[PDB]
Structures are given as C-alpha cells and as structure tokens.
Amino acid sequence: MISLIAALAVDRVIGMENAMPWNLPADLAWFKRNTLNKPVIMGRHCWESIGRPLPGRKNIILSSQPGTDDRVTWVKSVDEAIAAAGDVPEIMVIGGGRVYEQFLPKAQKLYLTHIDAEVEGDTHFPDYEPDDWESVFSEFHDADAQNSHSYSFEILERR
Ligand SMILES: NC(=O)c1ccc[n+]([C@@H]2O[C@H](COP(=O)([O-])OP(=O)(O)OC[C@H]3O[C@@H](n4cnc5c(N)ncnc54)[C@H](OP(=O)(O)O)[C@@H]3O)[C@@H](O)[C@H]2O)c1
Ligand SMILES: CN(Cc1cnc2nc(N)nc(N)c2n1)c1ccc(C(=O)N[C@@H](CCC(=O)O)C(=O)O)cc1
Ligand SMILES: [Ca+2]
Numbered sequence: 001m002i003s004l005i006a007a008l009a010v011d012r013v014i015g016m017e018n019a020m021p022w023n024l025p026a027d028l029a030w031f032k033r034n035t036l037n038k039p040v041i042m043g044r045h046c047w048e049s050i051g052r053p054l055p056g057r058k059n060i061i062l063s064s065q066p067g068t069d070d071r072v073t074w075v076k077s078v079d080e081a082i083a084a085a086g087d088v089p090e091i092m093v094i095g096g097g098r099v100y101e102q103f104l105p106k107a108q109k110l111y112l113t114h115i116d117a118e119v120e121g122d123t124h125f126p127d128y129e130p131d132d133w134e135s136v137f138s139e140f141h142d143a144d145a146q147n148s149h150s151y152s153f154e155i156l157e158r159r
C-alpha cells in the first residue's frame with residue numbers, strides 16, 4: 001500500500017522557500033519511526049532540502065531530468081517510483097506538495113502532524129475530500145522546552 005506522511009501548519013501550509021518553518025523534534029522522531037525500513041518517495045525539491053540520503057530507507061527521487069547522485073534511486077514517473085519501491089508492505093511518500101498531489105489518489109493512509117503554527121507558506125498540502133477518510137489514531141501534545149508549538153499526530157485510513 002501507499003501512505004503519505006506530512007506535517008501541516010495552519011491552512012495546510014507545508015513549506016516556505018524550500019524549508020519547513022518550525023522546529024519540532026517530536027515530529028522528526030515520529031517521521032523516523034514511521035518511515036524507517038520502508039522505501040520513501042520524494043520530489044527533487046524535497047531531496048535538495050535534505051541533500052543526504054535518509055538512512056535505513058530506500059530513497060527514491062522523482063525528477064524529469066537525469067539523476068545527479070548515485071546514493072539514491074532516480075525515477076521519471078509515478079508508476080516508475082512505485083515499481084522501484086518493489087514488493088513491500090508499505091511505501092512512504094514524504095513530499096513535497098506536487099508529489100503529495102500526485103500520490104494522494106493512490107494512497108490508503110495519511111500520517112499527518114497538525115502543527116499549531118501560523119506560518120506564511122508558499123506550498124500547501126493538497127485539499128483532500130474529508131468524506132474519503134476515517135481517523136484511526138489521534139494524539140495531541142502541548143508545546144514544551146524542545147517543541148515550540150503544540151501539535152497532534154493523526155493517521156487517516158481510506159474508507
Ligand atoms: N512534511 C512536510 O511538511 C514536507 C515534506 C517535504 C517537503 N516539504 C516542503 O515542500 C516544498 C517542496 O514542494 P514542491 O512541490 O515545490 O516540490 P516537490 O514535490 O518536492 O518536487 C517537485 C519536483 O519533483 C519532480 N516530480 C514531481 N512529479 C514528477 C513526475 N510525475 N515525474 C517526474 N518528476 C516529477 C520534478 O522535478 P524536476 O523539476 O527535476 O523534473 C518536480 O519539479 C518545500 O517547501 C519543502 O520544505 C514539506
Ligand atoms: C526537511 N525534511 C523533510 C521532512 C521533515 N519533517 C517531516 N515531518 C512529517 N511529519 N512528514 C514529512 N514528510 C516530513 N518531511 C527532513 C529533514 C531532516 C530529516 C532528518 O534528518 N530525519 C532523520 C532524523 C534524525 C535527526 O534527528 O537528525 C531521520 O532519520 O528520519 C528528515 C526530513
Ligand atoms: Ca503556536
């Protein structure tokens with residue numbers, strides 16, 4: 001199955017100037033826990049904002065151009081990305097916005113972090129139909145010394 005994993009601020013903002021405008025160690029821990037030992041698919045812009053392969057994951061990068069880094073697997077279409085991931089239980093799609101938009105119709109699960117942050121953004125999570133989805137896990141956390149916003153973790157499953 002295909003799952004999307006994303007962190008969304010107010011108004012579904014997911015980025016600004018190729019960066020993520022918040023500091024949430026707890027979200028990074030959640031991200032790692034839910035992507036480790038699974039293939040991860042990302043757009044070229046979202047790769048460039050990392051610049052190093054994520055360890056313990058098969059890193060698959062979508063680009064219309066030839067790849068520039070042999071440490072990761074480069075593919076030129078959605079269907080090639082899916083195929084490159086292979087016969088695994090769960091393929092994780094990690095962004096950014098244009099990649100999320102293309103994989104959302106194919107996804108069975110959404111792993112969302114709702115961050116209580118008012119951030120100007122230039123990139124937004126796609127506007128999904130709420131009726132298509134059922135909340136199966138939800139956990140809220142207050143802001144603390146390490147995490148400067150409150151946030152909730154949510155898993156939605158396609159009905
Ligand atoms: N969880 C999150 O909140 C989260 C996660 C990740 C990223 N982000 C943010 O997302 C933003 C980047 O999003 P974005 O939409 O600009 O870029 P993106 O989706 O990461 O990357 C877009 C690029 O991927 C390639 N691509 C996408 N679909 C393709 C296809 N079907 N076939 C071939 N190539 C394809 C193209 O590369 P070429 O131009 O090379 O063809 C395209 O320009 C940044 O602000 C980043 O910080 C947020
Ligand atoms: C910019 N970016 C994309 C990013 C960040 N947070 C997210 N959060 C969620 N919930 N979903 C995402 N797709 C997501 N993507 C990054 C940046 C750094 C690391 C990173 O270093 N991750 C380590 C965490 C190790 C560390 O703490 O340095 C890992 O093993 O996954 C991952 C993604
Ligand atoms: Ca806040």
Ligand SMILES: [Ca+2]
Pocket residue numbers: 130
């Ligand atoms: Ca509606």
